[PDB]
Design a protein around this ligand. Structure first.
Ligand code: ACO
Length: 176
């Protein structure tokens, strides 16, 4: 029933709308152009092509990520650098969401899996990291279930509705 494909420009309107509706961190319109145009942002859509009334190709889940030079990342302190391999990169998950009526079916887990499977194919890509809002227990349980390590708490990381919230840094290293 559920399939995964790269996000493309025809997803632009739906992508912006779903972020506004379910993703707490606000992004500017330029961000969504970056996502659908690719380049330094990789992303995946989840679709149910079995949906009635024409919306078969409309995404019902998404994950967006960007590529980060390992030595420019905030977790560079956690990495053992081997002089012979070069600096390497990291994949940083930016956003992740599933529409409410599709939740608790493993779609978010599968979306994260796509990002990890992607990062493992890039020669010197060292893994995946992200920040989770600290009071978002479902997200914490999800990344833990995917074997991500909860590293540390960052204070005042997020600004949401004019209120500051802490985040947790989560990392999955390909060779931990
Ligand atoms: C930046 C951050 O803070 S991280 C990004 C967080 N994104 C958001 O908060 C956006 C709003 N939230 C969402 O969109 C969603 O709720 C998400 C992305 C957090 C999870 O989406 P889901 O597709 O529901 O994730 P998934 O289905 O893989 O697991 C969710 C729950 O369903 C459960 N589940 C999975 N498959 C099944 C199944 N077949 N039968 C029953 N329960 C199931 C999982 O065990 C989990 O249970 P828990 O809630 O007790 O941990």
């Amino acid at each position: 029933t559920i399939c995964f494909r790269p996000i493309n420009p025809s997803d632009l309107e739906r992508l912006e709308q779903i972020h506004r509706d379910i993703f707490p961190i606000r992004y500017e319109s330029e961000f969504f152009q970056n996502v659908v145009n690719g380049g330094d942002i990789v992303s995946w859509a989840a679709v149910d092509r079995s949906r009635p009334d024409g919306h078969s190709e409309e995404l019902i889940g998404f994950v967006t990520a960007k590529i980060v030079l390992a030595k420019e990342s905030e977790i560079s302190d956690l990495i053992r650098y081997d002089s012979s391999k070069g600096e390497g990169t990291l994949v940083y998950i930016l956003t992740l969401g599933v529409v409410e009526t599709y939740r608790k079916r493993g779609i978010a887990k599968a979306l994260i899996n796509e990002v990890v499977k992607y990062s493992s194919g890039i020669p010197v890509c060292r893994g995946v990291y992200l920040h989770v809002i600290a009071h978002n227990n479902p997200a914490i349980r999800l990344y833990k279930r995917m074997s991500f390590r909860c590293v540390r708490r960052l204070h005042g990381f997020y600004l949401i509705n004019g209120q500051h919230f802490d985040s947790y840094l989560f990392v999955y290293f390909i060779n931990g």
